[PDB]
C-alpha cells in the first residue's frame, strides 16, 4: 500500500522539478533492466547533460547549456529542499562537488 503514497510524493513536487525530471530522467528512476543509451528522451538526445556545453557536430561551435549557472543553482537549491538532488546530473553547483573540490584541492 506504500506504493500509492510514493507517487503522491513525486506528484507533490513543484512543477518546475517534475518538468525537468520528465525530460531528463536519470538512469536511477528508469526501469530495472533499462539501458540509458536507448529510448533516450528527445531532450536527452539533443543534450546528454543540459548543464554542460555541447559542441555542435556540423558547426564547430559550442552551444551554451540549456540551463545557465544561475538556473543550475536554483534547481540544486529547489531539488535539495525536496530531497531529490540525487537525480540531477553532474553540476559544479552541487553541494557535494562544491565541497569535494575544496577538500581535495583546497585553497
Amino acid at each position: 500500500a506504500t506504493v500509492k503514497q510514493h507517487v503522491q510524493l513525486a506528484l507533490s513536487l513543484p512543477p518546475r522539478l517534475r518538468t525537468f525530471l520528465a525530460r531528463y530522467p536519470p538512469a536511477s528512476i528508469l526501469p530495472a533492466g533499462a539501458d540509458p543509451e536507448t529510448h533516450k528522451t528527445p531532450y536527452q538526445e539533443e543534450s546528454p547533460n543540459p548543464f554542460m556545453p555541447t559542441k555542435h557536430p556540423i558547426t564547430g561551435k559550442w552551444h551554451n547549456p540549456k540551463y545557465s549557472l544561475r538556473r543550475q543553482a536554483e534547481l540544486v537549491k529547489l531539488a535539495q529542499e525536496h530531497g531529490v538532488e540525487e537525480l540531477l546530473p553532474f553540476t559544479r553547483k552541487l553541494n557535494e562537488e562544491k565541497l569535494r573540490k575544496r577538500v581535495e584541492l583546497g585553497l
Binding site: 510514493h6 513525486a10 531529490v84 540525487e86
Partner: protein, 56 residues
C-alpha cells in the same frame, strides 16, 4: 483590409535563407513532439528517493 495587413507583415518570408528556413521548420517538428510524460512506474521510484531523504 486585415488579411492584406497580416499577409503584408508576413511578406518577408520569401527573403529567408536556407538556414533560416531550416531552423523554422525544426520548431514545427519539435513542438509536435510534446512534453515527455512521467510513468507512475517512475513516479514510484522518485518517491522512494524523497521518502529516504526526508524521514529515512
Amino acid at each position: 483590409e486585415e488579411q492584406e495587413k497580416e499577409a503584408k507583415k508576413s511578406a518577408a518570408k520569401a527573403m529567408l535563407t536556407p538556414v533560416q528556413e531550416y531552423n523554422r521548420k525544426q520548431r514545427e517538428l519539435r513542438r509536435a513532439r510534446g512534453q515527455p510524460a512521467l510513468t507512475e512506474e517512475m513516479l514510484a521510484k522518485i518517491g522512494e528517493v524523497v521518502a529516504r531523504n526526508k524521514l529515512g
